[PDB]
Amino acid sequence: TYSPLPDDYNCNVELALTSDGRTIVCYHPSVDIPYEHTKPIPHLEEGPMIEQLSKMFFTTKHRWYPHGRYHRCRKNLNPPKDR
Amino acid sequence: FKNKTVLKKRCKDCYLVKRRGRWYVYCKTHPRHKQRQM
Amino acid sequence: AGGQWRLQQGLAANPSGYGPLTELPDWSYADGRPAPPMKG
Amino acid sequence: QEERERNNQNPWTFERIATANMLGIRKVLSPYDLTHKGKYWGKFYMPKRV
Amino acid sequence: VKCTKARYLKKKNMRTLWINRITAASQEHGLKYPALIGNLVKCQVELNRKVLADLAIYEPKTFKSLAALASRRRHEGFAAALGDGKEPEGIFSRVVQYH
Amino acid sequence: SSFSRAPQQWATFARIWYLLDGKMQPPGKLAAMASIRLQGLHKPVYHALSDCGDHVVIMNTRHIAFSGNKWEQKVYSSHTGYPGGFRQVTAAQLHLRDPVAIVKLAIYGMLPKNLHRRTMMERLHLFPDEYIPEDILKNLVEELPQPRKIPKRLDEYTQEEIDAFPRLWTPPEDYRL
Amino acid sequence: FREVVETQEGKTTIIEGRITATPKESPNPPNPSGQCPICRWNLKHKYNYDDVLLLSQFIRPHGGMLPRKITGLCQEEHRKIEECVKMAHRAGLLPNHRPRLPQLNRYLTRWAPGSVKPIYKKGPRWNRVRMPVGSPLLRDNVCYSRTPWKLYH
Amino acid sequence: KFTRSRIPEKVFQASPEDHEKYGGDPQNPHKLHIVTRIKSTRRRPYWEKDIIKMLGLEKAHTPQVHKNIPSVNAKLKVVKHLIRIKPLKLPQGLPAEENMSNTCLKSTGELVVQWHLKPV
Amino acid sequence: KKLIAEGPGETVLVAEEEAARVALRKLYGFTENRRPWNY
Amino acid sequence: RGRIPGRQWIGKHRRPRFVSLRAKQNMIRRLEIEAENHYWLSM
Amino acid sequence: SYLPGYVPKTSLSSPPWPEVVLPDPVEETRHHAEVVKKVNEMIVTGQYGRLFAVVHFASRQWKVTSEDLILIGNELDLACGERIRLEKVLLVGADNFTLLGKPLLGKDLVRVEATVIEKTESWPRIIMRFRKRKNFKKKRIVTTPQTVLRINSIEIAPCL
Ligand SMILES: [Mg+2]
Ligand SMILES: [Mg+2]
Ligand SMILES: [Zn+2]
Ligand SMILES: [Zn+2]
């Protein structure tokens, strides 16, 4: 009955060794979210605009100001995509 | 009144106590015997 | 980490020193032939 | 003093480390320190020291 | 010149960064990093901080097994702290002898 | 996984809203756990370049307590800029004027001194009382536990615990008390 | 114990003392051959201010601490628990014991708040004015964690 | 002033307490000292750094063998505080000519003649 | 009262259609954790 | 406030450095193995 | 009635962490073997999907899977297009289980095959060693050899 961690949020975990004791194996099927643990489904100018979207996105006003042409040209237009 | 690091009871009426963060010495019969800790 | 524990059993404090972690061959041919020894 | 140095639980004293020099401590030390072992530092005297 | 010695900074920065990652995933499961790797090397698994961190990224179910494996070794070690010998050794604390 | 590219990337680097009750907790320990959650160190995918920080909400910042006489000993000093503008205020006086203050400048030291500091600071939220607007109260995720246990008072200790606890000594009857 | 009352009659007054219920300890001392209670129950290094169950037994209803001669405690222990009750008194754990009549939370405070002065300037690391916590008396308590108690922050 | 420190020979006389601790029996004493360097050669006198070079321990964490005889003892005595010393002991007899290549060292100072590289 | 798929999303609609996509992959057996092509 | 006269590590007055249990634990390990050494190069 | 070492309930009476007890070893041995054999027949029946693997090679670890590229900062003396079987693996894991070693897995358990595809000279890494106000400066450009491997496929054996 003893368990090392609560097996109720991520996966039902159990460890196991071969009888010789040279390799360790694990069995961790993911938990099933019960139905009880769910819910039913159902202009302006620079000053006012930069602060209201900052209050909307929860960030500062600095990054929203426009940068110079020096940085706009240095931005890469064909960046490499992974996968 | 006078401050002094080490304290000494001059007479028997002198009594030393701890009050508001420092050692004081009071004497009702000889008020000049009062001595603060420094 | 664990260097004091490894030398307690007699193993190398650094596992890269000696033991099966390094002394075994690190690659072999797909047909099962033995690869030549490494320079190290 | 003589019973404290006899009954001290610390197995390490100035006598052992200085005479044997297990870390090259004779550089920082003096030759007079070999007889002025731990208690002394110039003119001072540390009776608490052992 | 700054490019040369920045490699050792790249090593130290990325190394310490992996410590923060594994320290983070351990705290999510209820452990700390110093006790974690101590159980790993005690249980004879030589997984460096790259894969140990990267394993927590993509399979937290696996890292949970590593944490569960690590936490069990702690209780085995504390059981050994009570009685060093004169007892059956821990099942996972058992070691492999090479020769 | 079997998740699409953009939705999976969105859920990974998404933000979450923590909640904390400051009743009988020290400002340091709640600041220690908060600061690491503000950069996103708790995320295994942490990287300082990627602003993967998460929001934090504190409650009952008025009902905080220090360990020691730091209500009196500790001093919070600042300088306006003018001559004589250097002033000092005890933690008690600073608490009477602003109960939100003690934590916000306490976390301010914990997190690093970068330009991401002020972004993470405003992301954090504070309230002296346990009354919250429905907007910021609805967008919650999880309430992490408190660092220290709160000791129980004599009126709180039930009788069966006192009976289980054994009396230790015999008082002589000849005593006024 | 005994309760004394001074009664009010017209042109007269009476003073009288009556005996009350005398509590006692359990009939099974775990550790005999103990002169003090901490030795009789093995609470020499395993107590604090928070476990107020025994602290309430060594105080008066107004909040006054009992004497050593009648309680029968050691000198080192008598000064220890009188400190611990003072930690509990300032922490507010015993609100029913407000002494006699006609703002902020607080805990782990050695000295009194009113007498203690602020530190307008803290020195460098080698002369830092670190604040106190607890006391040097309860340092002898067993520490379950490996690191020791940090009495001065 | 600082000079070469002569050590009393009485210090290097094992008592019965030391014998039971390290398990080194006085009779049948070992022959060879496994030597390894830990402390840096720098910030040491000229006589301390060249001796360890004369011993051939400029490299740290490099086990190197010396004799257990009074002549070489004087050498690594004056620079004893720069190195570790561990005795040589083996169950499998001296290394035979056929097993010259398949040798292997251990952290316990052992030198196994045979090394087949897999567990029991 | 038994689950098949779970899907994140920006809104409830995006999460709903994403969860519908998640089920379609495993129903047809095109999960990202499926057997790669042998050779 | 809190300055010191001249250089931090020399002279009549310098910064008073103090010890930590880490450095204590480090150096006792170096001389106790040297006591293990002292036993072995004897006999 | 009370043990001599017994103490009443306080904060420091017992440690802060909760007391625990490990299971008995005999049923654990039957639990160790039972959970292994159901995983053994699981892989024989083929319930698993992908299988990733960790590898010790060239003095450093990598997390790898099938159909994935990998680079090494040296030459192995292998002709392009040749296959190789890697010996060392720290662990391999599927969607619902993991196979960890002590430290590595057995030879017969796994068969990790990888093909060599490509070999570059590394891009020119420049180094400059400089010291101030003493006219000490120098240049050097290195092009270290690199080789690109790819793990074609990984499989596991029923032996366990
Ligand atoms: Mg490093
Ligand atoms: Mg200066
Ligand atoms: Zn007077
Ligand atoms: Zn006692």
Side-chain angles (χ1 to χ4, degrees):
Chain A
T1 189
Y2 180 80
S3 178
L5 297 169
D7 292 358
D8 57 352
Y9 65 96
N10 192 4
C11 50
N12 175 65
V13 177
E14 49 252 42
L15 278 293
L17 281 173
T18 44
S19 200
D20 58 355
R22 276 74 174 282
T23 57
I24 189 78
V25 178
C26 186
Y27 184 66
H28 46 86
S30 60
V31 298
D32 295 327
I33 296 90
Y35 173 83
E36 189 64 20
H37 301 165
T38 62
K39 294 171 72 174
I41 56 168
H43 69 89
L44 69 165
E45 65 94 6
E46 192 177 3
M49 83 187 284
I50 195 164
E51 66 92 20
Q52 65 92 33
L53 59 89
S54 295
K55 183 63 172 64
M56 186 173 72
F57 286 107
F58 294 100
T59 172
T60 48
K61 66 188 177 63
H62 295 84
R63 63 182 300 287
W64 301 108
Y65 289 96
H67 297 89
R69 192 175 170 286
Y70 181 79
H71 297 283
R72 284 197 298 281
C73 292
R74 288 170 72 79
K75 277 182 188 178
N76 193 19
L77 274 292
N78 49 16
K81 192 86 172 295
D82 189 3
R83 201 173 54 268
Chain B
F1 55 90
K2 284 193 185 299
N3 293 358
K4 191 151 278 196
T5 56
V6 73
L7 303 169
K8 190 182 280 291
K9 294 186 286 184
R10 291 173 181 181
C11 72
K12 297 187 285 294
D13 298 324
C14 298
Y15 61 97
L16 77 170
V17 295
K18 291 179 82 70
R19 290 183 180 180
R20 56 186 60 76
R22 295 183 69 180
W23 279 96
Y24 292 175
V25 180
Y26 291 170
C27 173
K28 303 292 181 65
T29 63
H30 296 279
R32 62 182 70 191
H33 292 184
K34 285 197 274 179
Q35 196 180 4
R36 186 174 302 108
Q37 187 176 353
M38 196 271 282
Chain C
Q4 278 71 240
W5 180 90
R6 289 187 187 80
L7 58 93
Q8 191 269 326
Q9 289 90 44
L11 280 295
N14 187 6
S16 68
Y18 59 89
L21 188 136
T22 310
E23 290 184 354
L24 273 77
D26 300 344
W27 64 271
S28 174
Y29 291 101
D31 300 327
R33 298 177 291 172
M38 288 182 291
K39 303 293 194 304
Chain D
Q1 193 270 324
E2 67 91 16
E3 71 94 20
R4 274 167 86 268
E5 65 91 13
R6 275 189 305 93
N7 301 319
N8 60 342
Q9 291 287 305
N10 190 4
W12 306 110
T13 63
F14 195 90
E15 291 90 335
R16 190 169 178 178
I17 65 190
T19 55
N21 200 21
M22 288 102 74
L23 290 171
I25 310 105
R26 295 287 297 277
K27 281 179 77 177
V28 293
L29 291 167
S30 313
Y32 291 98
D33 290 332
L34 189 60
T35 57
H36 303 165
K37 296 171 279 292
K39 285 79 167 169
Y40 296 81
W41 180 243
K43 62 176 175 176
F44 298 94
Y45 182 82
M46 284 76 81
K48 304 179 284 296
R49 189 62 53 180
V50 62
Chain E
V1 169
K2 293 166 77 169
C3 169
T4 54
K5 55 169 72 66
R7 300 164 170 126
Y8 295 94
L9 275 292
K10 189 180 174 181
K11 296 286 186 73
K12 190 179 276 289
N13 288 321
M14 294 186 70
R15 184 175 175 80
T16 56
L17 194 147
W18 301 332
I19 305 292
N20 297 316
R21 293 175 155 164
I22 303 163
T23 303
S26 76
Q27 289 288 327
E28 285 183 350
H29 291 288
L31 298 172
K32 53 176 80 71
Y33 178 77
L36 191 140
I37 58 170
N39 302 127
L40 296 180
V41 303
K42 276 168 189 183
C43 291
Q44 299 183 351
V45 296
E46 297 293 346
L47 281 292
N48 62 350
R49 280 68 165 286
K50 177 165 282 295
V51 297
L52 283 179
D54 298 339
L55 283 154
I57 305 305
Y58 290 88
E59 42 269 19
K61 295 197 289 183
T62 305
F63 188 80
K64 193 177 172 182
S65 188
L66 273 298
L69 186 141
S71 65
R72 191 174 175 287
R73 183 63 177 74
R74 296 178 66 266
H75 301 301
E76 284 186 351
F78 306 146
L82 299 166
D84 308 328
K86 67 175 179 294
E87 290 300 335
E89 61 271 15
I91 295 96
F92 289 7
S93 84
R94 191 178 291 94
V95 289
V96 175
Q97 294 290 326
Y98 295 91
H99 65 294
Chain F
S1 165
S2 301
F3 295 104
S4 289
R5 293 181 179 285
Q8 184 264 317
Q9 185 269 355
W10 182 258
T12 306
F13 289 96
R15 307 182 176 169
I16 46 168
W17 300 82
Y18 288 111
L19 181 135
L20 191 143
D21 192 1
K23 287 178 76 66
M24 302 295 291
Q25 274 74 243
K29 298 191 174 292
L30 59 91
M33 65 182 73
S35 61
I36 59 176
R37 298 284 172 87
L38 261 67
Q39 301 97 22
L41 291 175
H42 70 285
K43 302 189 177 181
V45 294
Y46 176 79
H47 200 252
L49 278 296
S50 69
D51 193 5
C52 70
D54 292 351
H55 300 87
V56 173
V57 182
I58 312 303
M59 288 195 296
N60 286 295
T61 60
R62 187 178 289 166
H63 301 82
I64 56 178
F66 293 98
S67 62
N69 304 116
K70 294 188 291 202
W71 284 106
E72 293 80 7
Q73 294 277 0
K74 194 179 279 292
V75 299
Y76 288 113
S77 61
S78 178
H79 188 254
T80 61
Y82 298 166
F86 181 72
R87 64 176 73 88
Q88 303 175 336
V89 292
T90 58
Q93 183 59 253
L94 185 136
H95 191 273
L96 183 63
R97 298 292 92 194
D98 189 4
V100 187
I102 294 90
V103 302
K104 77 175 274 287
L105 87 165
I107 289 90
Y108 190 67
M110 298 300 290
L111 81 165
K113 281 67 168 169
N114 303 328
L115 301 172
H116 291 291
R117 181 175 62 185
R118 299 291 182 77
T119 68
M120 291 183 278
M121 183 58 70
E122 60 84 26
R123 273 191 200 89
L124 184 143
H125 297 285
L126 302 165
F127 294 95
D129 201 353
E130 58 263 27
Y131 181 79
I132 310 292
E134 58 266 22
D135 305 327
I136 185 59
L137 179 135
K138 186 175 184 294
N139 55 9
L140 267 51
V141 163
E142 193 273 342
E143 175 173 1
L144 75 164
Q146 292 174 353
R148 64 182 290 277
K149 280 65 62 178
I150 293 159
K152 291 174 77 68
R153 305 181 284 177
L154 277 298
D155 191 291
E156 301 179 356
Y157 280 113
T158 178
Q159 187 61 248
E160 64 91 17
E161 288 177 358
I162 291 155
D163 300 332
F165 188 88
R167 178 64 171 282
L168 302 160
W169 60 289
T170 180
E173 197 274 323
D174 51 358
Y175 183 62
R176 190 192 175 77
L177 198 143
Chain G
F1 310 136
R2 64 190 184 176
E3 273 158 22
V4 180
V5 194
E6 184 268 327
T7 43
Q8 189 58 268
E9 309 183 9
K11 298 286 135 173
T12 56
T13 189
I14 304 298
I15 291 157
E16 190 150 323
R18 281 90 72 194
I19 303 100
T20 189
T22 297
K24 286 177 77 67
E25 64 273 8
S26 300
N28 300 118
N31 186 15
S33 71
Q35 282 76 42
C36 60
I38 56 166
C39 179
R40 286 188 298 101
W41 299 86
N42 306 323
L43 281 298
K44 66 188 289 189
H45 292 156
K46 302 185 285 296
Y47 68 101
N48 211 4
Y49 72 97
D50 55 6
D51 54 348
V52 303
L53 301 173
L54 61 96
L55 279 76
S56 60
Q57 300 167 353
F58 295 107
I59 53 170
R60 291 179 191 196
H62 290 285
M65 207 269 300
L66 305 176
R68 188 190 163 193
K69 299 286 181 69
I70 290 161
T71 57
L73 274 65
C74 295
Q75 198 276 328
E76 61 91 26
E77 182 61 19
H78 182 77
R79 66 185 297 171
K80 270 175 197 177
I81 60 172
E82 84 188 351
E83 200 275 351
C84 287
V85 298
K86 288 164 66 164
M87 306 301 283
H89 273 108
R90 296 189 180 92
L93 296 171
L94 64 168
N96 293 321
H97 297 77
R98 185 68 62 189
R100 189 259 295 167
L101 285 164
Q103 289 80 9
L104 303 163
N105 294 114
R106 182 172 290 156
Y107 70 102
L108 284 170
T109 67
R110 187 185 295 176
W111 300 114
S115 55
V116 166
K117 296 285 284 186
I119 41 163
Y120 293 157
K121 53 182 86 72
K122 57 178 84 72
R125 293 189 176 80
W126 62 272
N127 197 4
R128 190 175 288 285
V129 178
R130 57 179 69 80
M131 288 64 74
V133 176
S135 69
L137 279 297
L138 75 163
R139 190 180 295 161
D140 302 328
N141 283 331
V142 293
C143 183
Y144 286 105
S145 58
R146 181 66 66 181
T147 61
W149 294 98
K150 188 177 280 186
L151 280 294
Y152 301 97
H153 290 177
Chain H
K1 55 182 84 73
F2 174 75
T3 53
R4 294 184 192 173
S5 49
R6 289 178 68 269
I7 312 299
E9 61 269 16
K10 187 258 280 176
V11 171
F12 299 86
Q13 295 181 358
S15 300
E17 286 80 349
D18 300 329
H19 286 303
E20 193 270 325
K21 186 174 185 290
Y22 305 109
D25 55 331
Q27 286 82 25
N28 316 288
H30 70 283
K31 293 165 73 66
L32 302 170
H33 295 284
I34 296 95
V35 178
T36 307
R37 190 171 62 78
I38 304 98
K39 182 68 180 285
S40 171
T41 303
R42 304 299 306 287
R43 291 184 171 74
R44 295 294 107 198
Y46 67 91
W47 61 81
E48 285 198 6
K49 53 168 75 69
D50 58 3
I51 284 168
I52 60 175
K53 183 170 172 63
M54 286 142 79
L55 296 168
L57 280 298
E58 64 90 9
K59 193 74 167 290
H61 300 276
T62 304
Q64 194 271 329
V65 169
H66 286 301
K67 293 190 184 184
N68 184 11
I69 48 173
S71 59
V72 308
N73 273 125
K75 282 189 175 58
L76 79 167
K77 267 163 91 77
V78 56
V79 300
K80 69 190 170 52
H81 66 290
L82 273 295
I83 48 165
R84 180 77 73 75
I85 296 98
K86 192 182 281 293
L88 190 149
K89 56 187 187 296
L90 52 89
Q92 302 90 26
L94 291 168
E97 189 64 19
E98 58 265 20
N99 298 324
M100 288 278 122
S101 299
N102 59 355
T103 57
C104 184
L105 280 160
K106 303 294 293 304
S107 298
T108 62
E110 295 289 340
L111 182 64
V112 304
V113 67
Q114 61 92 38
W115 182 263
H116 62 94
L117 192 45
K118 48 167 69 63
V120 300
Chain I
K1 306 293 182 70
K2 299 295 294 301
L3 77 166
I4 311 98
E6 202 277 297
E10 189 70 5
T11 62
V12 177
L13 277 294
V14 174
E16 188 175 359
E17 62 89 17
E18 186 63 20
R21 287 172 191 280
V22 172
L24 287 164
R25 268 81 71 83
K26 56 162 76 76
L27 278 168
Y28 300 159
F30 290 84
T31 63
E32 283 182 11
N33 59 4
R34 70 193 179 278
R35 291 282 179 82
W37 192 253
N38 294 320
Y39 289 90
Chain J
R1 189 177 174 78
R3 66 183 298 285
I4 46 170
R7 184 170 278 284
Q8 194 170 355
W9 294 99
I10 59 172
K12 197 179 172 182
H13 302 281
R14 81 195 61 176
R15 199 269 298 283
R17 181 63 180 285
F18 290 100
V19 192
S20 69
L21 78 172
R22 184 182 291 169
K24 293 204 286 288
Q25 285 176 359
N26 280 321
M27 67 185 291
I28 62 185
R29 191 183 291 94
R30 295 289 190 77
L31 60 94
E32 68 92 19
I33 63 193
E34 190 62 40
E36 182 171 0
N37 295 348
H38 284 181
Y39 176 83
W40 280 124
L41 81 167
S42 73
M43 51 170 82
Chain K
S1 69
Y2 300 161
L3 187 71
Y6 179 80
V7 63
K9 181 62 176 67
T10 67
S11 63
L12 298 169
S13 42
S14 46
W17 61 82
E19 187 63 19
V20 300
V21 297
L22 293 167
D24 55 38
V26 177
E27 190 270 326
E28 281 284 317
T29 43
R30 296 187 285 95
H31 182 73
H32 286 114
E34 188 272 351
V35 169
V36 163
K37 191 256 280 180
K38 66 187 285 296
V39 168
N40 193 4
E41 65 91 11
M42 182 172 175
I43 59 174
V44 167
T45 48
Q47 299 292 337
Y48 67 93
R50 282 188 81 83
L51 70 172
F52 58 84
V54 183
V55 64
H56 185 272
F57 178 81
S59 72
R60 58 185 72 80
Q61 301 285 116
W62 289 278
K63 182 76 154 54
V64 296
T65 73
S66 68
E67 63 269 10
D68 57 346
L69 293 163
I70 195 166
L71 186 142
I72 57 181
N74 54 359
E75 60 183 2
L76 305 172
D77 197 350
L78 275 293
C80 286
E82 292 183 342
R83 299 174 66 78
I84 49 170
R85 180 170 179 286
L86 296 165
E87 296 88 335
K88 300 178 181 63
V89 299
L90 274 293
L91 73 162
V92 306
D95 189 15
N96 295 121
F97 58 90
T98 49
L99 271 285
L100 274 75
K102 281 187 83 69
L104 73 163
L105 279 297
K107 302 299 296 300
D108 60 347
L109 197 142
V110 307
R111 178 174 184 85
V112 177
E113 297 177 351
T115 298
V116 67
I117 308 101
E118 199 275 337
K119 290 171 77 70
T120 55
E121 65 185 70
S122 56
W123 68 281
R125 296 186 75 84
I126 56 158
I127 68 180
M128 190 99 193
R129 273 66 167 279
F130 186 83
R131 312 196 166 162
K132 59 178 62 49
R133 71 175 73 74
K134 53 191 81 70
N135 200 77
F136 197 88
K137 64 192 288 297
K138 53 178 72 169
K139 284 175 79 69
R140 201 265 292 280
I141 303 99
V142 305
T143 59
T144 60
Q146 292 177 346
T147 305
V148 175
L149 272 288
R150 197 201 278 282
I151 301 94
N152 302 106
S153 87
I154 299 160
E155 52 269 16
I156 50 170
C159 278
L160 182 59

